[PDB]
Amino acid sequence: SVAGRIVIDDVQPVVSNGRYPAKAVVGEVVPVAATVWREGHDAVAATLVVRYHGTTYPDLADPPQRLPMSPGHTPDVFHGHFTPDRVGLWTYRVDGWGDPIASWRHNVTAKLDAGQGESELNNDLLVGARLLERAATGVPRELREALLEAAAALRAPGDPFTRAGAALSAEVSDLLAEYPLREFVTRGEQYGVWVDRPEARFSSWYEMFPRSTGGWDAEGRPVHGTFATAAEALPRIARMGFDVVYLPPIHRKGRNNSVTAAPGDVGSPWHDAVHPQLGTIEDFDEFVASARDLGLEVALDLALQCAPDHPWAREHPDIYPLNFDNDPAGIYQEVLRVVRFWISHGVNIFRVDNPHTKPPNFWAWLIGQIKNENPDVLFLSEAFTRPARLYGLAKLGFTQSYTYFTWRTSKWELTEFGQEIAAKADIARPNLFVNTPDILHESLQHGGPGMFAIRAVLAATMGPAWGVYSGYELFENQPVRPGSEEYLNSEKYELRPRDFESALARGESLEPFLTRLNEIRRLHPALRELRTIRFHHVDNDALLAYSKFDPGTGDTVLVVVTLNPFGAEEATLWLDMPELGMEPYDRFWVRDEITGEEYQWGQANYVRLDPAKAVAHVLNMPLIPADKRLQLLRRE
Amino acid sequence: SVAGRIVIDDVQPVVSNGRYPAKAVVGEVVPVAATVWREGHDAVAATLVVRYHGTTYPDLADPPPGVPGAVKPQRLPMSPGHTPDVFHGHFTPDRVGLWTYRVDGWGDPIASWRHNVTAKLSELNNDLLVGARLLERAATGVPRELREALLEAAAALRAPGDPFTRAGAALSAEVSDLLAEYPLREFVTRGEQYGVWVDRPEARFSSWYEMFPRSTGGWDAEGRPVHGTFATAAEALPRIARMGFDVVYLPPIHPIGKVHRKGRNNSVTAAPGDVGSPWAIGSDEGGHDAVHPQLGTIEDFDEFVASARDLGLEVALDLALQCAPDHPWAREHPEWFTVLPDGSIAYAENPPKKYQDIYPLNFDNDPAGIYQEVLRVVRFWISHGVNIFRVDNPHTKPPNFWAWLIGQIKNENPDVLFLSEAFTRPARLYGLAKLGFTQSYTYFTWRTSKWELTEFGQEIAAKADIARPNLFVNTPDILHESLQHGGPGMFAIRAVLAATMGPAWGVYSGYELFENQPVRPGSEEYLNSEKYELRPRDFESALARGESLEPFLTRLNEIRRLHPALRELRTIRFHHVDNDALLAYSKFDPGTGDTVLVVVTLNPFGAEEATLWLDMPELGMEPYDRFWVRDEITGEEYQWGQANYVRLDPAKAVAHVLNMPLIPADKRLQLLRRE
Ligand SMILES: OC[C@H]1O[C@H](O[C@H]2[C@H](O)[C@@H](O)[C@@H](O)O[C@@H]2CO)[C@H](O)[C@@H](O)[C@@H]1O
């Protein structure tokens, strides 16, 4: 936000006055917006100055393209955009300037229309000549003639419409777009945007315990799985459309959180070594390779705690939390070594467990030290903490963040949530996990199969990043103690194998539905975007309705979802017609990616959802028109 | 907003990321707020660092090349609020100039330990020594008197003698208080330094009266008006003083141009002997540093200013930067004008307003030149005792110009104040305010509905850090259709709205006389405007006959003077009242705790009753509390609760200005709070 002959103000995207960069992915249309003004009726304009700086990640805590900007409905507010083409730091700046030809074009096309004579139009014409002559200076010598001829024409004697003809022409208009006469160019402030690989914003996660991939012996007793049986587990997870496979720690406490373990109990998985029963570093290397061949990524948990008997407890003075204060340099250097080790082992995704319990400046340093060395490493923060810290950690450079989504159950909670996630889109990318081996929500506990499908739609559509724990597809809703948020017989304390193949064959698996959800996502680029979520009024406290669009392709999707998993719910859906790139009186066609149903729709549309037939409607909304798709993206 | 071992974020008051300072006046309690956090359950705290830099006004915008011109750090505590991780502070600047606040964030180890050593509800525990270790450290930060408290406390928990209750000293009140004044601060993260330009109180709180000196002349025995002087104008002042207005604003007192002189009722050609527009500054007699010959001399004016000072009034001159075709600059410096190809100076305009009698100045051709001359002119009147300027459509002149001029003036003399008459888009309006314009003219004149006024009042309180408004009930160019049809009731309604809502309010003469005559039907311009003819008024007669708002405007000013609440802007809270043509709002002083509540009808014809719903904790109370009130309009007392029945007869009185129960000290500051 600057002040000169031209004033530039309230520029976006600015993050905490500029202490941190904005978040983006390669291919994302980043909308920019600034308040630009000057004196009098005189014309003003703005240029968006975008520059790439490479893959140099900045340390966030103490331990050239010239693109045009168009004005909008909101006076004195100009809007711009850009689509970064590679991972790295890009910087936008807003150049403000007076537009004398724009002014002249208007103030003279007015008089010459409509319909004044050569006498009263003589002066403005001769000034227009002075401008084209001035503008010509900015045009390379080989392209000038057009302008000079045009200028000499206005000063030649005759009829206003004939004189102004050349200056008003297309040839000139185009040429002036490429080389404009920009007066009093005021340079705005430089602002950063860290651009990440698309998997940072759009990715479907599947959490799986490798030890539970074991199966059973002919007797019925479970087998402790290896990286090999886990590698065998992968193709259905691949076939379900998940692209990230998150494993809990691969490095006492007994069955169902009991303080003393019975001999032969598995123990809780929660630093540069693999579990002997799982395999070797070589076995894991093979596991990672197997995942890559299926087009899957591996995500490891980076939990920074020690069991009382850890090598660090003895060497560098059921869990011990680490102390970052006594020997900062020491711990800082070892964590970095550990993380680098797995990066070297083909792991480019880390799920940082409870970051809010560890120093903010630590994360910043670690996130930075890694990202400079290799910018493709991504970090997800499992911070279920106050919003200050949650978003605070995201600003620090955490790629994605775990959200309040599981406790957002009501229509109103969900709208407030969806709206908030779209608002904080520049500072945080959310990961909506339907639940975790730590979180079994009371809604799912009583709602049954319908509930599981409802939540999966909500997460998969609303969240560009969504996740499922192993077993969600088998409707795992049995809670340990009544009212507890923990699972009965948690996979964390025992070998929990599952015959998914059987469930599917019997028809007791959400496995096919989760696939459709991922197919829909893959097909619809609108489900990738976050900022474009808009809610639409559906009159029924049990139904929820929201849209989304891709500013690049114009793809539009509308979701209509029941929150009652037992009985059917009907209502009238009222569409914000221009929001979807239309007029209120317009009528269009829609395809339901769920049922395959096709219908003519208007502003007001009757809707009915039977949780026996399908919990939601994922409509294929008419493609947003090019000119309307940037207007719709707009900030102010 | 910073990042370190402690994170400081979403700090307020920040203006355009810090490009411009926040607005304040001496005695104003400035609330500060920040989001401060750290890791885990460990204790965090914040310190507000206030530093004075003197009366050095900063240049806020990049000026053109060639254009020349010319302590004891407070550490104040920040308490947390209802909103987690948000700390709140405040400060009252005692001396006019630049002030800078910073938010220091830090870990509180004793706070942590205090909590962690409870635990007491037991043994074995010899962290009762890490506590001793802390108090011993903390003691270093305490002056060698009152450090004893801490040493005794530490030595106590270091003593083996008896239970873990030897730590009672460390946990004590005496210690807790002492540690508030001199805390043990870990990992002190210094936040961003943010400016606040503190002005003299007349910048925020002042009542203006606009008067044309030429119109103070009176009539001859034949009925024809007489052209007034600075002497007759000096005579018209005491009633303006008696009405409680402290600022007397005069339109240009400069020789009006003879060339292209506009005649009666905006007629393009003037009849012989027509007065002409005061805003067409400059004839053969003089320019912008000269007085109108018919008004008097520089000496006459000096006497006029002195007369105003003796009545406790201060003069506000109009700073209009245009020239009549016959101005001294038009002959001497045609490089300050936009000479068209045909060799003529461009005629002045402001869509839909055309000004055939003026030439607008050109700031681009010779920037250094014009910049230096405007300064000279403004300095001239400052030297003549004028410390207030009512700037004419500043939005028509360069932004960087204003910034440079306001700066160049305030460095030399920080007491000079500038009011922007910018009726333009909000971007530019507030934009100019951020640039350093002391007060701004508002959309107030067209905010008629209950909705419009609540949306307005709320907006003015929101933009309070970047702009101080001046609510003028009417101007010699603004005669609103509300006033044209509403009759005397309307006049009173608007005056209440302006005087209460706006810490700065204004009245243009003839208003106390209910002048509703508009030139053309539906036009906002006055029939027979004072700008083109000598419009004298016998105020004394009207008062006597019974057609003067003169006594009511005085009560409004008395009320204002008595109530420090009607000075503060940010504290405007609207209270729900069922009638849609009735409005209710509060205001409080964060220093004195004074509370005022206004209940005003917008229907000037018939009476309006309704049930008033109070946001009880906002008046520093609980919902089932029941208090007493004293109307400043009626004088008497009434029993009021959370819900109160109200009735307003515009025949009896258009509004109720209640003297609400004084807000309790501890509650005062929570009602001020930002987040
Ligand atoms: O040429 C002088 C010009 O003066 C008046 O215009 C004033 C306006 O009335 C005031 O409100 C002031 O703040 O701005 C204008 C300055 O030009 C007359 O209205 C106008 O006809 C006349 O030409």
Side-chain angles (χ1 to χ4, degrees), chain B residues 24-40 43-46:
Chain B
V25 287
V26 174
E28 201 181 308
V29 185
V30 178
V32 168
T35 308
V36 189
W37 63 277
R38 69 171 302 176
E39 72 324 314
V44 89

Side-chain angles (χ1 to χ4, degrees), chain B residues 249 262 266 277-280 318 320 322 355-358 390-393 421 475-477 525 531-532:
Chain B
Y249 155 61
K262 241 183 191 137
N266 209 101
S277 180
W279 291 274
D318 198 321
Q322 58 234 196
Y355 317 129
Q356 306 87 337
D357 46 332
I358 50 161
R390 190 280 209 172
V391 178
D392 254 34
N393 19 281
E421 189 236 34
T475 36
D477 13 274
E525 283 276 357
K531 315 187 283 185
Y532 321 89

